Ligand binder design. Structure first.
Ligand SMILES: CC(C)c1c(Cc2ccccc2)n(COCc2ccccc2)c(=O)[nH]c1=O
Lengths: 543, 402
């Protein structure tokens, strides 16, 4: 017996036909078990023997469950699935422990066979027809069709999920002080009710779920705390991060090191001190995933350190809406940042880190702005609001930057926290031409075919120079010119050029670049006391 | 009965994601959606409906309330057209008033066969709950088919107040109404209410809309740099006015003198700047709108709260050009300034050609996407892309009223 609820109307991917295939022949051993099963289900009202008017068919398979050691049934819906209408499936929105409000107690209901507990839209049922094969094709196969949501079929998780929702509709209404999180085969139900009133209410939902056709999970398969919910252990007052172990050996292959590295990168989030420079180094010029690599001394060291760090106990408190949501950010190096959101000090709700992307060009304030807001989005997702930021930047500096930065930008409400190193503007081009200082008229050129580049300068002060370069691009010489201007000038310079890229720097004032030439130029720039980059149009000689 | 509305040929329905919503905004939308459900306006829908359109909550005036803002931009594009004109007098009246009439659609059923397309979802904090899926039963507010179906019906309700005084011009754009009257302040507002009150059973003046020209910096003393600047900008301007010359100016530059040196402008270089100023003295002849083309509008952040924009279709053939100075409140917020600007510009557009322009925004997609709805006011939503402001296009328009 199953649920007497409204069947969702399913249609085959708008424009096709049901699958059909020659049932993969099975041994008499398998086939036998297969009939037992199908007949049981038949009576439970789940599947139904049928007539030869069904052109459709899906492959059934018997797999020896490496758990109970008996023959289990498994229908292969790959084909039906590749022709079933797409359903609303945004369920890839997995809560994060940090946003869960603490509950006096949680109880986890099992509703596993529930897919089989929800009927199937009578019209669609036909397409799921499967057949139990016969011994050497003697008495033609036993024909069945599904009456309920078949497990392995595309629409089941969705349909089952929505059904559960309709059925919880009543309950939730009646008691709006009982939280129920529906995930796969479990309903994590919690409350702030006294343990006895809570225990009664859970019992109530159960008799309701039974009322609704969903059979009760025997007290053997009862899941209890801590809850092992992928990546974490949800304890009543705290949630922890499941310990990640490093599989040690005395022989590591490419595949080994990569998986490790991938696993260590992941760990880097809750562990800002995980390093993979050395380990990753072992990838250089590899020749097959099967290839075996010996760790450097430094890599061995690094791995070692990572093992220890991974031992340190990571976890966080839950969400108390009655308190502030605070987020603090630190820059752990050029293009790498750490944040830790918490309501109470030390009581981190969650922490993490952002990385760069060898930005062709940016400043650390921009980068700080990107981290802040990225956080902001995950805070909205998790807690429906944004944190009061506490950032390592002088408001003076911030005001100073965003004021004239060409791109629109903003940091929500934030306060300053002097936890060095502070974020600042490595340099600032002067607003107007520098009085006194030498003026470098720079110029670079290159024959795009030959790569015979040439770049130089002429200062108003008679000084001059021209460097020969081979294998350089138009861009390179153009910048190199500016670079030469800078390497040879006093603490203050004025430099005029036609470079569109130079101009692309006047506006952005980057301090991180993809192009190392541009990174070396940034070097010279920060060294100087006063720098005034002025631009004028090429193809017209001024020097 | 209701007219069958279909999507355009070869198009599927909108399947947009709902960006994250602020807790205050979700709570509200639920509250808003419950009443509509009861009122039979929207209906909870299942997983068999694979479509989706985003919803948000914006804020009104004097009623510290939230309004359901649905972004049908995509649905709209996929919606069949509605024919198989704009009254140019509106853009001239020294006064127009923005009024909403979208509330009127709830009284008009939506073709049952098209409802699935209006599917939308209310998010959940931390995803501890499914999205409250709904779908519209009536004409969706903010949809394009709405003003259209309710057109014949909008003709009759409007007719009397129009026939009252053929003088006034009212434009119906999507969910709004722009009322034009040359009468003084109290006058406009007085005849305005009669329309409003009649509807039971902002005061803009399209004149200050000067597509402000360019002015070249007069200067007692000119340095090498100043010329470099001037020249570098005239060269860009020549992309617009090809009669702009920079030679005689460049001669005053031939030499590696110090940037700060004072260069006396030759008489020849003099006339050339003078010639250049004349040329700039008026818009490039030959620029006139084209209805079959998309109206473009890019904005440049100018700093100090200043902003510049240009609406065109053909590059360099600007149909209008202007500047924005943050409203005394937008201060430490470019996002607010940028939103206000976008809305300002968008209305100016509608009033003139009856369509919203497509924006080229000097903001990071991610920064825009996160906070724009917190300052948005308009019942409609423009098309928009994100760009990197080229260094001279800004400088050129930097040459404004100063
Ligand atoms: C009911 C759900 C939504 C819920 C839970 C369970 C929960 C478990 C797995 C996945 C999501 C949620 N917890 C997790 O807390 C663990 C725990 C264990 C034992 C007693 C109380 C709490 C919580 O703190 N607040 C909640 O609201």
């Amino acid at each position: 017996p199953i649920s007497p609820i409204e069947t969702v109307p399913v249609k085959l991917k708008p424009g096709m036909d049901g699958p059909k295939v020659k049932q993969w022949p099975l041994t008499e051993e398998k086939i036998k078990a297969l009939v037992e099963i199908c007949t049981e289900m038949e009576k439970e009202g789940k599947i139904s023997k049928i007539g030869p008017e069904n052109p459709y068919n899906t492959p059934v398979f018997a797999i020896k469950k490496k758990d109970s050691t008996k023959w289990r049934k498994l229908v292969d819906f790959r084909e039906l699935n590749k022709r079933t209408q797409d359903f609303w499936e945004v369920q890839l929105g997995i809560p994060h422990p940090a946003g869960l409000k603490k509950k006096k107690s949680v109880t986890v209901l099992d509703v596993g066979d529930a897919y089989f507990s929800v009927p199937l839209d009578e019209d669609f049922r036909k397409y799921t027809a499967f057949t139990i094969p016969s011994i050497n094709n003697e008495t033609p196969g036993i024909r069945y069709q599904y009456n309920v949501l078949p497990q392995g079929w595309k629409g089941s998780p969705a349909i089952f999920q929505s059904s559960m929702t309709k059925i919880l509709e009543p309950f939730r209404k009646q008691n709006p002080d009982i939280v129920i999180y529906q995930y796969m085969d479990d309903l994590y139900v919690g409350s702030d009710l006294e343990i006895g009133q809570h225990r009664t209410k859970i019992e109530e939902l159960r008799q309701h779920l039974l009322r609704w056709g969903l059979t009760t999970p025997d007290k053997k398969h009862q899941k209890e705390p801590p809850f092992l919910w992928m990546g974490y252990e949800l304890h009543p007052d705290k949630w922890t991060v499941q310990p990640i172990v490093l599989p040690e050996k005395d022989s590591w292959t490419v595949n080994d090191i990569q998986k490790l590295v991938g696993k260590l990168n992941w760990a880097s989030q809750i562990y800002p001190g995980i390093k993979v420079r050395q380990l990753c180094k072992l990838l250089r010029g590899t020749k097959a995933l099967t290839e075996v690599i010996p760790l450097t001394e430094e890599a061995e060291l690094e791995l070692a350190e990572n093992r220890e760090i991974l031992k340190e106990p990571v976890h966080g408190v839950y969400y108390d809406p009655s308190k502030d949501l605070i987020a603090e950010i630190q820059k752990q190096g050029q293009g790498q940042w750490t944040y830790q959101i918490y309501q109470e000090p030390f009581k981190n709700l969650k922490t993490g880190k952002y990385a760069r992307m060898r930005g062709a060009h940016t400043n650390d304030v921009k980068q700080l702005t990107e981290a802040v807001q990225k956080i902001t989005t995950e805070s909205i997702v998790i807690w429906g609001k944004t944190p009061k930021f506490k950032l390592p930047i002088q408001k003076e500096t911030w005001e100073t930057w965003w004021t004239e930065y060409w791109q629109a930008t903003w940091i929500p409400e934030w306060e300053f926290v002097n936890t060095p190193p502070l974020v600042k503007l490595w340099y600032q081009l002067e607003k107007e031409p520098i009085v006194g200082a030498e003026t470098f008229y720079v110029d670079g050129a290159a024959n795009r075919e030959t790569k015979l580049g040439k770049a130089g300068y002429v200062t108003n002060r008679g000084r001059q120079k021209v460097v020969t370069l081979t294998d350089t691009t138009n861009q390179k010489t153009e910048l190199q010119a500016i670079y030469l201007a800078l390497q040879d000038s006093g603490l203050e310079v004025n430099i005029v050029t036609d470079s569109q890229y130079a101009l692309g720097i006047i506006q952005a004032q980057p301090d991180q670049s993809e192009s190392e030439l541009v990174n070396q130029i940034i070097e010279q720039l920060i060294k100087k006391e006063k720098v005034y980059l002025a631009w004028v149009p090429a193809h017209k000689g001024i020097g | 009965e209701t007219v069958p509305v279909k999507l355009k040929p070869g198009m599927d329905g909108p399947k947009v994601k709902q960006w994250p919503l602020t807790e205050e905004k979700i709570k509200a939308l639920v509250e808003i959606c419950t009443e509509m459900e009861k009122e039979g306006k929207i209906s909870k829908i299942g997983p068999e409906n694979p479509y989706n359109t985003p919803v948000f909550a914006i804020k009104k005036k004097d009623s510290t309330k939230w309004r359901k803002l649905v972004d049908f931009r995509e649905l709209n594009k996929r919606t069949q057209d509605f024919w198989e004109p704009h009254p140019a007098g509106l853009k001239k009246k020294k006064s127009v008033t923005v009024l909403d009439v979208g509330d009127a659609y709830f009284s008009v059923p939506l073709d049952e066969d098209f409802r699935k397309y209006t599917a939308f979802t209310i998010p959940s904090i931390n995803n501890e709950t499914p999205g409250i899926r709904y779908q519209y039963n009536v004409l969706p507010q903010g949809w394009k088919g709405s003003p259209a179906i309710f057109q014949s019906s909008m003709t009759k309700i409007l007719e009397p107040f129009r026939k009252q005084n053929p003088d006034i011009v009212i434009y119906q754009y999507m969910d709004d109404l722009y009322v034009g009257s040359d009468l003084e302040i109290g006058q406009h507002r007085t005849k305005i209410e009669e329309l409003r009150q009649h509807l039971l059973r902002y005061e803009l003046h399209p004149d200050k809309w000067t597509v402000q020209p360019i002015v070249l910096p007069e200067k007692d003393s000119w340095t090498v740099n100043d010329i470099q600047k001037l020249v570098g900008k005239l060269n860009w301007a020549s992309q617009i006015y090809p009669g702009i010359k920079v030679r005689q100016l460049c001669k005053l530059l031939r030499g590696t003198k110090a940037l700060t040196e004072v260069i006396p402008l030759t008489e020849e270089a003099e006339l050339e700047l003078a010639e250049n100023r004349e040329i700039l003295k008026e818009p490039v002849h030959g620029v006139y709108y084209d209805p079959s083309k998309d109206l473009i509008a890019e904005i440049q952040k100018q700093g100090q709260g200043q902003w510049t924009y240009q609406i065109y279709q053909e590059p360099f053939k600007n149909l209008k050009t202007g500047k924005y100075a943050r409203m005394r409140g937008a201060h430490t917020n470019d996002v607010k300034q940028l939103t206000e600007a976008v809305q300002k510009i968008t209305t100016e557009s509608i009033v003139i050609w009856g369509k919203t322009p497509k924006f080229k925004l000097p903001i990071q997609k991610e920064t825009w996407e996160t906070w724009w709805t917190e300052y948005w006011q308009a019942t409609w939503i423009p098309e928009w892309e994100f760009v990197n402001t080229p260094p001279l296009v800004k400088l050129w328009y930097q040459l404004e009223k100063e």
